[PDB]
Design a protein around this ligand. Structure first.
Ligand SMILES: Nc1ncnc2c1ncn2[C@@H]1O[C@H](COP(=O)(O)OS(=O)(=O)O)[C@H]2OP(=O)(O)O[C@H]21
Ligand SMILES: Nc1ncnc2c1ncn2[C@H]1C[C@H](O)[C@@H](COP(=O)(O)OP(=O)(O)O)O1
Ligand SMILES: Nc1ncnc2c1ncn2[C@H]1C[C@H](O)[C@@H](COP(=O)(O)OP(=O)(O)O)O1
Lengths: 159, 176
């Protein structure tokens, strides 16, 4: 189907949006799968460390896996901070060269909100240049954010 | 009902041919599936790997992890790679066992002489001439599976018979 490439600060709402989006798609009979730290970091990317080079390879491998899911006809949602513009652009081009729909989705809450949420007590990021969608997770709720994504997918005939 | 059907065998043994026919059968019977092969893996995810023993180890490790994701997503994932090393195929199986996902090792078994006689891509001739170095079966090893779930004797069974053998295994193991 396509790749829905989430990006945004820690605590902005990527895990939450991806879970609710997958729920909506599954209940509407649309095949979908999420790539996230829980299924990538200790599997495909277990042999990558902290160096810039390895982080670049981390994103490249995630993008190539999302591309296979998209080619297979799934909505593939990636849920990573994805901080660097160059790496997001590389992920985009991996898809665009194969004519696979790619949606860069900026999960956008202010740092202050993310810090106040501190969902995991964890408490630089390059904001998306021209993403296909911005989800303002401080001003609307999870269901409205999901609906914005679904609308985007309908317009491009994925849903 | 996701799972991985892991093909292994010499160049020209019939992996591409079996995977295509099996995918077509499954699609036509309403069973989601997807094939991982050289065409969608070795110039994408694995574009930064060659054919040295260590790069084959990594090729197969990465493919195993991706196949686990597809099986986890509920697809029948068919992998079509020589996968010549026992240790690496066993690791691929362990990755699936670790995630409670069924894994079926299918040995696509044709004698080397048959594969050389088929010489589908002219590679065996080049290998013998030393024009390609490290070609599996000529100048690098193929370790035959000793406990595969299924052996497809592609020199004595036709493609449709081989596909039906795989479908039967999937039925026995409650996948389809
Ligand atoms: N030296 C070497 N040895 C074996 N096959 C090679 C080699 N050079 C290239 N090819 C071509 O690549 C394919 C094997 O790649 P795999 O990813 O299946 O190999 S492994 O699982 O990593 O061992 C073969 O399929 P083909 O189209 O018949 O040509 C062959
Ligand atoms: N519209 C919205 N979308 C997503 N999450 C929201 C939201 N409004 C409030 N939240 C909350 C739910 C979670 O407690 C928190 C986001 O946590 P998360 O999804 O785990 O973040 P991330 O995966 O981006 O690190 O913010
Ligand atoms: N039972 C069988 N299964 C698969 N291929 C068979 C077969 N009987 C004959 N063939 C032929 C079809 C092809 O020309 C050749 C196998 O080529 P292939 O599928 O490209 O091999 P591989 O992908 O293992 O390198 O053998």
């Amino acid at each position: 189907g396509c790749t829905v490439w989430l990006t945004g600060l820690s605590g902005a709402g990527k895990t939450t949006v991806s879970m609710a989006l997958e729920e909506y798609l599954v209940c509407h009979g649309i095949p979908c799968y999420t790539l996230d730290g829980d299924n990538i970091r200790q599997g495909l990317n277990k042999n990558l460390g902290f160096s810039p080079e390895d982080r670049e390879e981390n994103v490249r491998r995630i993008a190539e896996v999302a591309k296979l899911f998209a080619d297979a006809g799934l909505v593939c949602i990636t849920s990573f901070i994805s901080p660097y513009t160059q790496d997001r652009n590389n992920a985009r081009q991996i898809h665009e060269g194969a004519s696979l729909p790619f949606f860069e989705v900026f999960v956008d809450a202010p740092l202050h909100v993310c810090e106040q949420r501190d969902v995991k007590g964890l408490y630089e990021y390059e904001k998306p240049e021209a993403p296909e969608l911005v989800l303002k997770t401080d001003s609307c709720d999870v269901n409205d954010c999901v609906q914005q994504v679904v609308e985007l997918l309908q317009e491009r005939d994925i849903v």
